[model samples]
Target: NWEFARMIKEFRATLECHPLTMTDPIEEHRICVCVRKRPLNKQELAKKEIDVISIPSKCLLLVHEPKLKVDLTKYLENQAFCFDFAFDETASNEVVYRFTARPLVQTIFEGGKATCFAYGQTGSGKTHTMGKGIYAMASRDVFLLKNQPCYRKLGLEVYVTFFEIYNGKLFDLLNKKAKLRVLEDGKQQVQVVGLQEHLVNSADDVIKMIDMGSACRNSSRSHACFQIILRAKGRMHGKFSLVDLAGNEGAEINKSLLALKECIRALGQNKAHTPFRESKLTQVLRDSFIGENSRTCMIATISPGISSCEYTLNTLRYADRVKE
Candidate 1:
């Protein structure tokens, strides 16, 4: 018992003693990696697990792995991970949205394609970060932009499409749970055949659609992708993608997630060819990663509880590999 307490104390001291590793901005800002470390929930705190994560800098994530086993040499090694942007447990929901999602909002408005996604384990706050946390606020901003003073002059139109990739099948959320087919037309454009698109007039309308689609969502594991397409006179079409990736758990539950992981590894290694065709999820997202003009922002969510150290580290590693 004494050794256990000592080890835990030493771990906390180590985190405080060392300075975090800092990194520069992402090159040309083509792709951005953001991290959110959620505070320990009631269950975690009740378990008395120490918080092992710290953000020593604005863009760095630090994890001090505590030595839990007396004879384990591997547990002694602490880990530190970095990202383009990082948020600590105390960050408010609005703060998270402004730093992570607002920039993409501006990008889409300026006629650029951009995407944002949340990735983490189940119960790690990924759902809240995307749905009520970030997406809700971002959509409100979009609504405000549409009602701007010069909106009439610009002739802007905002359209929303909500869909999910469950077990490699596409389900249109706004279209009464209609099963859609993924088609590659002659011009090489990926299309979700027969999917319904809703014209959004207000932020409430968009949020209402999100709620309706969520109700019709698959009861099993799935990836929810939201698209906000912006159209205006004399400007090329721009789109913003908000993705809430399925939590990594079972390989049997969603094969598309496995394919996505493989594709991400290929991209990280600078491979010329990626297996996007291996899964429908990757097939739809292929353009975001492959196109020279497209930009992507990934928000990797993690729990700071000591019990979640392994999963948190794995998530940070995955996020590190995702950076260009």
Candidate 2:
């Protein structure tokens, strides 16, 4: 049997280094180019905001790109948790390629009861990071569970549960019409519930399952406040939970925007009674998150643009609280 555990350990080490980057947080520079006008005459002019220039509606660089250090292993010990690695796909695309992030997920499959999630704002690169890129290695290029490191080495049983939160409701991505539902068990203790299970033997099998889950994902809005949930199954009795939380928008914005509003409200009331049960995704994850189950980590993504100053700062503050 191949000793892939060492590879997983080394990757975990790299991710632990992330929090330390805080001492010297990544710096993003913004240069605004404006024409210098000459003073002509002294005239009283009314102040009015004008849309001088605007980018296409589809692609609006409202926030500056963040200088993110996806190396989470650099921050702490080689302690593995429900989450193995959270990659910034957009940054990865610009810096490296897709294969770089795939191995970590592949490793998690080898280890039972492990969870891997992609987070950040809607377009911060979560999907791209988790998804396979064109530059993947031949070993990872194939999508099948029977060929995964976890299944091959550990010989541990593997299963999957995939779902998403849309408009503050949970919908089963693995099923066509699982329907949206919210459960208030009144336990205040919520956790990852068994949604669906798939037997796998290799890394390729897990990859295929992930592909299927992605296809059914709720990518409805063109907005950047969507959240997705991915759970890993293990032969051991214990379970792990990892969440790539949706972004929290500003107050001036309409509260009508589904999950964002829910997240904002959650942020305000950080007391013990967090309504994690309000939504399908949050409810199912409440246990692994709030209660006790397995290791949890949040890779909060941020941008370095003037427009994103408020949002980025808000993100850091949230990350600090979650870290505590």
Off by over 4 Å in 2: 1-119, 133-155, 180-194, 218-236, 250-275, 290-293
- The sequence of per-residue lDDT tens digits that candidate 1 reaches over residues 298-319 is 7898988777888888788878
Give the C-alpha miss distance for residue 61 in model 2, angstroms: 20
Best by TM-score: 1
TM-score of each: 0.84, 0.47
**Per-residue lDDT of 19 in model 1:** 28
Query: Which pairs of residues have clashing backbones in candidate 1?
Result: none
CA lDDT scores, all candidates in order: 0.73, 0.35
- Candidate 1 — which residues are off by over 4 angstroms? 1-28, 68-75, 149-152, 218-220, 233-236, 252-275, 290-292
